[PDB]
Amino acid sequence: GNLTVAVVLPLANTSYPWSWARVGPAVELALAQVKARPDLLPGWTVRTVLGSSENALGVCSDTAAPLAAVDLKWEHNPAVFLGPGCVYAAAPVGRFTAHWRVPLLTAGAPALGFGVKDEYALTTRAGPSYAKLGDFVAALHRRLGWERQALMLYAYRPGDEEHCFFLVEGLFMRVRDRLNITVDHLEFAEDDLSHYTRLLRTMPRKGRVIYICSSPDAFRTLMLLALEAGLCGEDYVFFHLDIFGQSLQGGQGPAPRRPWERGDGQDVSARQAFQAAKIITYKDPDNPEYLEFLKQLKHLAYEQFNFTMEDGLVNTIPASFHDGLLLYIQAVTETLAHGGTVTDGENITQRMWNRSFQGVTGYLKIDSSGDRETDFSLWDMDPENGAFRVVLNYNGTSQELVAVSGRKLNWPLGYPPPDIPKCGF
């Protein structure tokens, strides 16, 4: 028989980590591998019927994603959805598919509200989540001894789909649960220098361990302002939540990075200001299978969709769709082997949750709630060269930190600064 796979992704806009111009060859490679392995759905054929989740302007829309999903459901009767990876498009489509009793795979939709599996039954997330980043910092605080207070700033920009609002919402909500610490939750406009001055005035009263979600330019500007304000590294620690490594040119390899450099005269004084800054990115998989998959993905993305892949850390999202789709196909194969159909949403989904799988991105594990366990990296600056390099790797499954071969965190005083000064704030 056949197994339709409805796809609701941006088909023309090629500026998203999940856009069809980069996820298309991932699914194509996955389906090419399914058809060469007798152990996966013996004799069946897997098809894709693809709709678009973007409006007339060409951007994510919660208005057109459900329309496309309903059209696809009415016409083709899919067995699964590679639902939207976009926070605003994913919610209505996930509610529709939960009402229809159809599984929904996605390597996007990292928002916290999507993880309420009473309203979003049968949906799986094979890619990074935002709440899983609250486990990482919780593991930092236990290791570094901070157990009192923290502050969390998130920038605002008119264009983006409130990326940092959701990022820090998830981080904050999970950090409250894991730790009984006092956290503060602030926002600033990313273009108003008045807001930056106000923020530099404010912080000395609210915390000594600050997590900032902003663009690389805004974080460099904040560091330069803080250095002038006197906010040195013997007191503060600034953590830049740059998940896709945009300030590190992707952060895809061992090359030395120096994100404090712009060649604008003040980059001599920007190296000084970054002595109290560390960067929290996703983890770049090291296995050779990932490199081979990237090598043969970059070629399909050119021959098929006439689009050139950028060679960064956003490729993990195209690879996670491949891994998740293969995991789903294996679950469906087991379900059929136990005498079922490809329409048993509940039986199929409970064979995906709470198990480990071997993909190109490593040996991953979908947790008991359906969300994938995410691994992170912490970058710090070398005292001698001045270049940034990875110093800590966090394994989501076992929930522990590993120091890279011959590296350790660079603290100005040799040890982390306390999160509570001599006489508080």
Place this chain on the structure above:
Amino acid sequence: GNLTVAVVLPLANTSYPWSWARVGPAVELALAQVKARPDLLPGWTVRTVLGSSENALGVCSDTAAPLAAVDLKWEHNPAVFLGPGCVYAAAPVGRFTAHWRVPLLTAGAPALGFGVKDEYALTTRAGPSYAKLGDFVAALHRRLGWERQALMLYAYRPGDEEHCFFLVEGLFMRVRDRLNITVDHLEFAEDDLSHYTRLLRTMPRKGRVIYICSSPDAFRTLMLLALEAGLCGEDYVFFHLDIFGQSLQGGQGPAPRRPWERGDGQDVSARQAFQAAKIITYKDPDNPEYLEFLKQLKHLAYEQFNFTMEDGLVNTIPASFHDGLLLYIQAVTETLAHGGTVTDGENITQRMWNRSFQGVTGYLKIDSSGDRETDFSLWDMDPENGAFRVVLNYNGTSQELVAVSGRKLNWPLGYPPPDIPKCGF
């Protein structure tokens, strides 16, 4: 043949002006009238299929309204949607119907954003709109000579579906388009006594003609504070946007109201504070057909839904569904007389827009944009008795103001206060 009307309304919750417990008898009376007249749809049969637009908690929601609409569309293939009335349920369902090319009738959904007929094609609003209130105040200002400045407060309450936010949004937008005056629109928390003191401090600098959208209790508690602060009626005038006449015992009939009285000991001091307050409600139709319709609607509602229908000015929403639907039943008849079909949404809709109809609520007119022309009423205090009464009626179609039974506005100084003082603010 058969004509199927799809209904997406609260079927169990009885606390809405459009809830099925009070709109069901209206539609049943309409369909009884259709079946007794050879003029309308000769020989056809009209029948309704019901879906609920409320979630588990029992409140109308934007999550369960489109789900019910999609289920109804896929199962019964309706010719028209007697769509939702909530501002939040009516948007996704309106977009779905616009995408399907199916007309959507509603006497609710007054929000301004629902009147953009490029995104909401084929939808008709046979009931009051919020922007149509901005036509009223403009026609009021021209009559009283105010042409400089205005201020608009709206209350915020956790429970309501941001009723006053949308009311003031529509009013403010339409007043901005139709006048050159400078308008400023604030917000205040309704159950936070600090905000009231803050507002009484603020107002004397930002306006002298104020429109307040709040609950009757909030308006009275704020008028007492205004009297205490010295904001008397020789300078300020306060307009209470109480559209359904909640503060006037429903605002229907000829009896005299006393909205300043609770027997709490401040009645003597509350009658004095209301000398600078006037109330803007909907207009209660004065024709005998409306009274007969109410008489045979209450009995039917009690007999057929075990719900007792207290009289008031919220009964115009049940009666508009009765009118609009009938208007539609006429339009779809004329189409058939020209060789069309019941599924000619575009030709059916343009035969409803920009024409007048004779219903139980008067001789109504649907404007060229599809929204009905609403008539308003202005209530003012009698200087002698101290009881409130209707003193102005506003005809939406022709946009004139009519004094009622030789009545006149009670201005504490004899003429309207200036909207800009001797030396401004």
